[PDB]
Design a protein around this ligand. Structure first.
Ligand code: AGS
Ligand code: CL
Ligand code: MG
Lengths: 312, 322, 66
């Protein structure tokens, strides 16, 4: 019944991109099934290829999310922008299938649109330059598409500033020691920069909950102390602690060290490459080329039936 | 055949499009009405691509799409009812229907539109509540002016143009100094300030306030130097005494004439006394050179002017355009 | 009610004067931040709100109940 809880429940993140694990699983499975059905119907127009499993889709989504984060670190981008880009990526590929649009391109598309969503509107040419992309249009061709995928929700909430605020709140306690707080803040911030972005943390937990989970991972004592202080001054306390513990475990399953796991060449060759070959043989033939999709949609919007280049 | 595409088409079918109300360089507005309730009217703003911009989606489009959703729910902010993509790969915003124009056309129509102190008080209350709701959610508007204050059917004023908005920047995060129309830009932005706060908006509000009283732009400079000179002339010359560090702003400039002492409350009474002493006080508090001493939106809503007679006009009784 | 019944009053936290962070010290004395009107109070309030906003929002149960 807290006012801040209501104001958070009024956000687009909660009403549009916050579900239960079962709902998210069913959505991903249905999206994969719809992609398979559409590509199968299109192909017959005959030996069909082997389509990706929902698990394989999720594995590729996680790998390319980690690669997007590495790219953002290479571009010296702000934490908020990197988190927004990763969230846009995950949302687009929860509403769209990996077999429909190429993630290798949607990664850069999400980084660009996240820059825009965080108030930074760079020149597309400078962006492509910094990412060694020769044709900048290859990025623009996905922009509006990505906008549709995330269902036009551009306001994404992150727990970094919440972490700093919680550290400030703990600083007022006279028993806590400054060095311990500094170490805890550093570790919790290092966690927030990777763990909640590679897992489904944003989908099942609140920025405050994710921040408290990262802190509990950095120093459980301080997080438990903060919760005890807030609730000393009931059932809600136990439920909050349980949610924080669930988020803590979901995060611990993918700690920042696992970065080296998602950039490992052996892990790539063993777990990633087969999936990419299967995708290269089962991908959507019409929707994969974003530049051509954009061209044909422009020509359909302008030229209705006055065509002079169609030969049959 | 895409699921998201058919979902967008289902959302687009929810509203029937009608007459074209306006043709703008930024977007085209059509009248519309809900399919389930044809009595429920709505405005469909279809954002037309700007051929001049080669960097993809325009910043004003993204900014509106983000912040209109963030702020929706307040009576004095234009309501973003829905968003959907059209078949021609364009953006469409289904918004509140505000047929009574804006506040600029009411102010300018001096021959036919008559309003008094209570009306200015009600309008300023609406504007101040809108800006307070903006800042309460950590959003700067940075383009507050009369023509961006639309009027609903019942007379409630809504802040509309969010193409220049921005979230509150963190410490050390630089912001643009090129925001807010020249006539309504605060002195710190003219000086190129890169780390400012909500005060920048309050200044614009003040400049709206003043414009409501004299029914003409207060400081209508044609160049940035003209704006600085007008602020020095009619408000006061900024100096290290009243504004520590002003001479160190990235683009600080002074016409190098005899400095003008900052005018006090009484100095305004001669021109703006139409709103009464208490009212003028508020005006003065919104027009402080140092943004640190500039009144805040919360402080503004708590000012004594609102409860001072005469009471503000009921929105149902506000002046309408002819 | 001057805020039109929309006044935000936090429930589980309060923004007091003693709140501060050492990383802010280097900016609070930066000429541009003070002379340009940057609000550290607003930043502190935003940080606290985001740290406590939605603390009791149980996504799984609330979404499965709908
Ligand atoms: N609820 C509404 N919101 C916005 N515009 C409306 C609304 N209802 C009617 N209109 C009409 O929309 C027109 C203005 O559309 P806008 O999209 O705001 O373009 P504009 O801002 O006038 O053009 P620019 O880009 O500033 S030169 C006016 O002619 C109004 O009659
Ligand atoms: Cl008059
Ligand atoms: Mg306009």
């Amino acid at each position: 019944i807290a006012s801040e809880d209501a104001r958070y429940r009024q956000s687009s993140q909660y009403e549009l991109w916050s579900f239960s694990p079962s709902q998210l699983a069913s959505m991903r499975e249905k999206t994969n099934a719809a992609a398979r059905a559409r590509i199968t119907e299109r192909l017959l127009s005959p030996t069909l290829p082997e389509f990706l499993t929902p698990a394989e889709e999720l594995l590729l989504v996680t790998f390319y999310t980690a690669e997007l984060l590495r790219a953002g670190d290479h571009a010296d981008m702000s934490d908020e922008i990197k988190a927004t880009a990763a969230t846009f990526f995950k949302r687009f590929y929860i509403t769209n299938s990996i077999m429909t649009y190429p993630p290798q391109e949607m990664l850069l598309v999400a980084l660009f649109f996240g820059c825009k969503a965080e108030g930074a509107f760079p020149s597309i040419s400078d962006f492509a330059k910094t990412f060694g992309r020769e044709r900048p249009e290859e990025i623009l061709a996905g922009e509006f598409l990505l906008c549709q995928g995330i269902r036009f929700a551009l306001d994404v909430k992150h727990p970094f500033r919440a972490l700093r605020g919680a550290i400030m709140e703990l600083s007022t306690l006279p028993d806590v020691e400054p060095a311990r707080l500094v170490a805890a803040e550093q570790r919790a911030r290092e966690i927030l920069r990777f763990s909640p972005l590679i897992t489904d943390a944003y989908f099942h937990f609140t920025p405050s909950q994710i921040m408290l989970a990262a802190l509990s991972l950095a120093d459980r004592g301080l997080a438990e102390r903060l919760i005890q202080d807030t609730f000393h001054y009931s059932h809600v306390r136990d439920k909050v602690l349980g949610t924080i513990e669930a988020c803590r475990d979901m995060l611990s399953k993918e700690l920042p060290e696992r970065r080296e796991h998602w950039n490992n060449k052996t892990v790539y060759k063993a777990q990633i490459q087969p999936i990419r070959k299967k995708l290269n043989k089962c991908r959507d033939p019409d929707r994969w080329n974003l530049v051509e999709l954009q061209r044909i949609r422009r020509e359909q919007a302008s030229r209705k039936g006055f065509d002079s280049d169609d030969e049959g | 055949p895409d699921p998201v595409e058919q979902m967008n088409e289902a959302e687009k079918r929810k509203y029937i499009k009608g007459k074209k109300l306006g043709e703008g360089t930024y977007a085209n507005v059509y009248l519309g009405h809900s399919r389930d309730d044809p009595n429920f009217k709505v405005a469909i703003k279809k954002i037309k691509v700007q051929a001049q911009y080669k960097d993809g989606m325009a910043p004003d489009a993204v900014r509106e799409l983000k912040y209109l959703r963030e702020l929706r729910g307040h009576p004095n902010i234009i309501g973003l009812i829905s968003v959907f993509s059209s078949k021609d790969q364009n953006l469409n915003l289904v918004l509140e229907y505000l047929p009574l124009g804006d506040l600029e056309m009411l102010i300018r129509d001096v021959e036919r539109v008559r309003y008094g102190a209570a009306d200015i008080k009600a309008w300023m209350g609406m504007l101040t509540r809108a800006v307070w709701w903006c800042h309460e959610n950590f959003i700067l508007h940075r383009d507050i002016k009369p023509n961006n204050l639309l009027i609903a059917a019942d007379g409630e004023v809504k802040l509309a143009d969010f193409g220049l908005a921005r979230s509150f920047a963190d410490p050390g995060r630089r912001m643009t100094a090129n925001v807010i129309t020249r006539w309504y830009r605060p002195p710190e932005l003219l000086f190129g300030a890169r780390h400012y706060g909500g005060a920048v908006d309050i200044w614009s509000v003040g400049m709206v306030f003043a414009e409501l009283i004299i029914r003409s732009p207060f400081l209508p400079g044609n160049t940035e130097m003209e704006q600085i000179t007008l602020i020095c002339k009619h408000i006061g010359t900024p100096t290290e005494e009243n504004w520590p560090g002003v001479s160190k702003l990235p683009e600080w400039w002074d016409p190098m004439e005899e400095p003008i002492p900052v005018w006090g409350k009484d100095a305004y009474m001669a021109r703006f006394g139409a709103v009464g002493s208490e009212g003028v006080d508020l005006l003065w508090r919104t027009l402080q050179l140092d943004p640190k001493k500039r009144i805040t939106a919360r402080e503004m809503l708590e000012h004594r002017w609102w409860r001072t007679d005469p009471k503000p006009t009921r929105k149902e009784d506000l002046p309408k355009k002819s | 009610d001057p805020f039109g019944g929309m006044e935000f009053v936090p429930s589980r936290y309060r923004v007091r004067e003693e709140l501060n962070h050492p990383s802010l010290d280097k900016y609070r004395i930066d000429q541009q931040h003070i002379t340009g009107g940057y609000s550290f109070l607003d930043y502190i309030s935003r940080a606290m709100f985001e740290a406590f906003a939605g603390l009791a929002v149980f996504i799984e149960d609330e979404k499965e109940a709908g």
